[PDB]
Design a protein around this nucleic acid. Sequence first.
DNA 1: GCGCAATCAGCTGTGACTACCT
DNA 2: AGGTAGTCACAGCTGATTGCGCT
Lengths: 434, 52, 604, 258
Amino acid sequence: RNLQEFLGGLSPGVLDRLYGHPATCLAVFRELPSLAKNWVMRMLFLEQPLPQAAVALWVKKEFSKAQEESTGLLSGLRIWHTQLLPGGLQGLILNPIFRQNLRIALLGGGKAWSDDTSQLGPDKHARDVPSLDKYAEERWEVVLHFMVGSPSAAVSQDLAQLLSQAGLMKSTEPGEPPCITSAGFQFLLLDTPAQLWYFMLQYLQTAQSRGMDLVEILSFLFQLSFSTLGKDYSVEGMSDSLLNFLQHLREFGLVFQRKRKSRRYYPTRLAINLSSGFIVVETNYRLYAYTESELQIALIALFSEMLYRFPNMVVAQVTRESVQQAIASGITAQQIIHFLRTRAHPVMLKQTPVLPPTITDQIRLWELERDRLRFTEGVLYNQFLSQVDFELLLAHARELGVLVFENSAKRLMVVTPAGHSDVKRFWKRQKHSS
Amino acid sequence: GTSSQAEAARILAASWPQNREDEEKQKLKGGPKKTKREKKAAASHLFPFEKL
Amino acid sequence: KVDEYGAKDYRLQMPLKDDHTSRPLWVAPDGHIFLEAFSPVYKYAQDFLVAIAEPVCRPTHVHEYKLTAYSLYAAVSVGLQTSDITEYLRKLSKTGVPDGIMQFIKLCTVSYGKVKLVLKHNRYFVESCHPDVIQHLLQDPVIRECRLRNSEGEATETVSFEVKQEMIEELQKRCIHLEYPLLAEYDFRNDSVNPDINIDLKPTAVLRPYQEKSLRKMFGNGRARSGVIVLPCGAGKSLVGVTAACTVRKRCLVLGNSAVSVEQWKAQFKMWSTIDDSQICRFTSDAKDKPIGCSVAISTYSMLGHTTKRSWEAERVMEWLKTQEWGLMILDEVHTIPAKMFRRVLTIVQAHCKLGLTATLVREDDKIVDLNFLIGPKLYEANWMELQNNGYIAKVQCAEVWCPMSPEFYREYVAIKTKKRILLYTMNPNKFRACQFLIKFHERRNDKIIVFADNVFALKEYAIRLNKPYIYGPTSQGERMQILQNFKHNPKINTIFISKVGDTSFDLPEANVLIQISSHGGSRRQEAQRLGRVLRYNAFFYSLVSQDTQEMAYSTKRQRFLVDQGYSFKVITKLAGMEEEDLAFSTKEEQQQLLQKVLAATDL
Amino acid sequence: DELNLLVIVVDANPIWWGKQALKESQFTLSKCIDAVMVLGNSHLFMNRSNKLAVIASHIQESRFLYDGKYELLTSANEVIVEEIKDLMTKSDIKGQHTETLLAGSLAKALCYIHRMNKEVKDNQEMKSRILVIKAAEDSALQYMNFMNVIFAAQKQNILIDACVLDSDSGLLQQACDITGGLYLKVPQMPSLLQYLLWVFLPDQDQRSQLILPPPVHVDYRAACFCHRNLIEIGYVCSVCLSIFCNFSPICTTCETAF
DNA sequence: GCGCAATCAGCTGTGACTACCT
DNA sequence: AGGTAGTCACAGCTGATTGCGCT
Ligand SMILES: [Zn+2]
Ligand SMILES: [Zn+2]
């Protein structure tokens, strides 16, 4: 799920409250399609609505589908609203609050997003960008290891409960550590920015359980997205509810902070990417990974056979058996292809496409091997003496929506086990009624 | 006959690797291509008889 | 050594990763080399690794080479010394050489020049610089039979003694087991005993740089050593042999596989060596152009190793031939040297240098290891990917398109198992339709087509159905020659069928399309040879297999040599416009009729 | 994977802007600079990977100009303001030169685009375009250099868009027509920003979707070698293809070549 | 009647399938 | 409870026989 899908399902009041922050409006704007952005920019300095036909005539006829999609997305996001123009026409004008906040974010005005930074002067224990990146990577690796369940990863109980709520892991028995499910493997195979966004969406969905304001959290997250790397900001100016969210982000590695009582916080590279190579793939089904961390080694070994582990290199072979085992574990071939494409070494970027077509085709064909046979439990009816009798029962089964397979030539039909009783009762009644 | 031709075509052209590929295509992108670069790479990597 | 994930990890073994990644190479403790191709020093590292090790796979990004004792013997044969190779390997390691390779390299390179084999006055001698090693091997029972009569001391000058001529292969096999490998060096610069000939190649036949490198490695310090050069058939292979023969400047003997390859070699010599026809002779019991008193002789296998009664003229020719030394005995298609009767051929003639040429060094029965001592070390292994990148080798777009088994055939395929299922998946109607569609398409686009098809019983009905020329193989000599001659320069006919006949080095003309159906089981040599008949996307070749049959496994296991060479086999599952036009076996009636005629064999 | 680079060339000729200021009109150089900055901010807001460059042309040379709003835009606007203040305040008229060095600014823009293209990762294509706003009169002395710049831009497939304010320039029309760019003359100077956001803001791929004004009547009058003046009928040598206004018994260029 | 080319016998290479002892 | 000499298919070669052509 993406940002637009979540925003579409929100109530109009929540969307209106979201636009009150200049950072939120910019984040929504950058998620719009290319055609929509031009329309928004054109209507930026308009105080009167425009006719729908006039807006529609801007784009050529051949590209009308894209225009319709952009208009529908804008209406769903409530960026602009249809206005009852005098004379029976419908006028389109941007939301005044959204337009004002967008102009403030672009032209300028009001106060800064953050309170201040030079009030406390230079930081006594300021870190460096490589140190922040190392801290974020260590936190993310600790989280992912705790997903696996290694004793080396120790996190808060609230994080474990949140992971359980996300469905990644289940605790069959209290006290014993939870076991990661197939959805956990699929999430692990996902790209890190995708993983961060999915986790944040789950947090937003479950925030109502903790009594936290969705609008404030979204605005703060969007503000963090546009923050400059290596520059700190004042913690003060936020509610105590936002303090818990900030501490959770610090636990997740998005934001660095020396102490809980500290008034400074340093956004990391992960936080910036929240708004949105080391593997060399060879035609002989070999992966050469330039990684040292156990996380990438485990991820690669999930769907491949390891051969050599040099201190700064991993040589693995993608075999049919390993891919079949990984798919039986619950990972689809598309996820594997996407993971390989994302971690692609910069050298492979020259090739078009980056991943050789033969390897992707072979992986997809290996995926189809497991599901060659289709199994559907049901009850077969083959005792039809008359063609007309078969047709009526087939129509009744289709009405009940329990039909699986039909064959009018041989008068054969298959029904679901749940619907077998209903069809049997109907057939008994029809004979009695006859 | 004409019916035999159709039956043989149905048996052959869609025996193993179509009963799932066609279903996936029915549940696929549907819309336009991602980028023009993808189409160029596909045309380069496709055989001459697959581009006609 | 550790098996945490089933992978041999050597993280602790080689930690010397000082600063920091500039060396594009990785070493293995037991033995292996990984080279990064995307490096500014790629060419120099490749040249260094070629001279010291043989490749095991050459994909587009990360090459993998293997370190072997024979590779180190070849490296030390060239002017490279132990110190130089060790210091340059340590120079480009990026991880540090493990202390299992330096000892291995030292042990391999110490015993190189201790034992030498020489030929003089039609007599084989073994000479050693250090007299002690002779007494070291004196107690070996196998060696003692070579001397006759016991060769009491053979006092010369440096201690040497005579060996039995017909038992040279046994001592060659024993010496490597004794860690004293033999070396075959021919110092042709100063002989004064052998009658050198006036052969001299014309100064108009230029050669490519890789051929220059191969020849330069052949003649490292002014002498010629026995070795094997592997080059594609489309590339220049006969030119290398002709240049080597001219440089050796001695009486040359060329051995081919077929009775037509001798004519090919004669044509190559007449084209690029400027040799009078009196000196050139062909000894294949066809014309007998007075082989007695000749400079260059060309013949074939299965004629020098006859165990039966021989022709009167042939007997005298062989008697004359077995009474003088030979310079640079050239063997063609060296891959099929380790045979029951082909091995003794090298023992039936006497020569100083034995140069073997081939395109497909892969062979089953793991008998290629024997070729290391039968002739010599693998000298040069051309990189096919960079060879085709220069444009001198056609970039063939490999395809592995399979066809589903028709229902009328899969029942019989699963019903029978006693070797009778070959015809069932060989004559698959879907594969037949795919082949016909490919033939029609590539004829419409005007491409020369060669269709390889073993199991000629199936090929009969496969070719007569389309009414196209085919080569049964046991037909005649003139018919095949004329068919192949008119195949090239004729617009009306541009497609031919070959049944296991083109699985060697022939004079087949240039073609762009190759379609192989129902070849041998796991013959990587056969598939590589068939691919070699196309290169010379300029061209592309297809392989048709039947799904859910042993042919799938055969195709999977036979393409590994080519993927090691760097080729990728794209899988084609649907043929565009298959139903656009009409093809054979359109209806089920003829498909089910085919069952009777394909089961009509009943070879019982 | 779609990267767009926009280079904005600003005609900062002091004479024309001084005359405009003396006119006491509603449009001044300050408003033009503000409109350029707003257009750059919009271009940067269109996508994260979008790159912006601003070059101001002057009689002397070409200057590389590059609370509550975006942080990067705040830094970007301050740098442009500081550069334009430094260029204009320290601009001292030394000589009788009055024509704008438009060709040199375009050459610098091409060099900058070439530099930026190499730094791009091979997985992404950097679509680049050049937008020029013209205020002063066109210079006929730089005809050959301008044509060379146009051909170099066409070779690398770089769009050139001209936004004429006061007087139409034939060179800009030729550049727009050859390179496939958009040529537009501003009817009302105060509405410049709306025109820029409505016409030149979309990229080439988006311009296909939208409907845009048809190209204006592009002229192709050639420049004489010995006069450097636009002409309609003239004499052209058949060897060196040089163009002369009047007939000559001997070609000067061919005489020069030996 | 002699001479040249077609034909077969015998042996071998290549790759794969199959029936009895550590 | 797990592996190699015969055997089969399909080609090659050379060593003879063996019917066909005749200004
Ligand atoms: Zn003139
Ligand atoms: Zn001239």
